[PDB]
């Protein structure tokens, strides 16, 4: 595991990049190393045969919503785990790395959608949304809303708005 933690830049939440780690004898030797599926008692001796590795940048207070079977703005519209989760959810803070003078605007999180998300599903499409009757052929600002909002991530806030990197490995068989 050398490619998915020391990466210079991470993706947003409205999208996210994962991988298909395989054929490597995962040195799980490798801060909230919270693991759900199988505890690290025997994580160094297994026969999993297939592993994924996602990547996400989110506010600290919203990290709890990553865990399966919970509701939230980013867990009900951006990324939701199934009820039978088998993996681990690692996460630390990036207070002095992702934060930037006057803040960073590159990160985003979807705010509106038609319906909830199914597990392990993403949708990247910036279009006007929302209505009763939707005669919104043009682009306007009443009930026709830009779906994404950018985090603040100012150079210095108190804990709770600072950026946390969270990686959610999804084991398999």
């Amino acid at each position, epitope marked *: 595991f050398d490619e998915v933690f020391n990466a210079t830049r991470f993706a947003s939440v409205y999208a996210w990049n994962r991988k298909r780690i395989s054929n490597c004898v995962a040195d799980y030797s490798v801060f909230t190393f919270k693991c759900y599926g199988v505890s690290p008692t025997k994580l160094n001796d297994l026969c999993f045969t297939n592993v994924y590795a996602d990547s996400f940048v989110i506010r600290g207070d919203e990290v709890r919503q990553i865990a399966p079977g919970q509701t939230g703005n980013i867990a009900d519209y951006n990324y939701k785990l199934p009820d039978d989760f088998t993996g681990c959810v690692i996460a630390w803070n990036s207070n002095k790395l992702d934060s930037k003078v006057s803040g960073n605007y590159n990160y985003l999180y979807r705010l509106f959608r038609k319906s909830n998300l199914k597990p392990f599903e993403r949708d990247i499409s910036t279009e006007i949304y929302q209505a009763g009757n939707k005669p919104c052929n043009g682009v306007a*600002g009443f009930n026709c809303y830009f779906p994404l909002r950018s985090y603040s991530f100012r150079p210095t806030y108190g804990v709770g708005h600072q950026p946390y990197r969270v990686v959610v490995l999804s084991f398999e068989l």
Partner: antibody
Amino acid sequence: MQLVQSGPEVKKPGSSVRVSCKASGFTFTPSAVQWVRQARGQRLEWIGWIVVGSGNTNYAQKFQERVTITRDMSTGTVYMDLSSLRSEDTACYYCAAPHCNRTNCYDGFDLWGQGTVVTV
Amino acid sequence: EIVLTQSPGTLSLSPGERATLSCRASQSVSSSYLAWYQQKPGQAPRLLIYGASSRATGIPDRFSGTGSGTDFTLTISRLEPEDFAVYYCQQYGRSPWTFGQGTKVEI
């Protein structure tokens, strides 16, 4: 199902006033709440509006530099801040939002608050 | 920017009659973004029409609304004594937002 607004306030010229429009269900639900002023016997006059979701806001050019509409998700509160009070502002202030619970929204503005009287 | 004019200024008709009101604009306004309000002395405004053609829930059918382009109108078929009030026309399609002047109906 209704809007709650603070009681009357008293201010002298040059100060600033904060008015709270507190609703229920605003969080997690799109809701475009506007702000309208009305003096005694005069026509209604528009002030501002804000989207509870994204923070998007727009102010009248005249009332620019004098109006600040601020949002609070946790408490489901909306703040209307006015600075440098002038006698012409002495009027009743209403906050109106459309019926919005099921993601979608009633396009028209239907709910209206009880109003607040501000005099200076 | 958009200027709305409401006429007639005052009306004086007995209960049961038919009254008509005109709301005129200065630029094209989408017919899906116009509304009317009713105001009685001291109370909060009430929503009557949304979209210029859809009556709000529960309001009497005697109300009616049509129009397009830069001129919209409201018509009330059978008036009653409690309807004596002042009605404001609001176009709510294009920022900046705007209201009307007002009207009065009595006998």
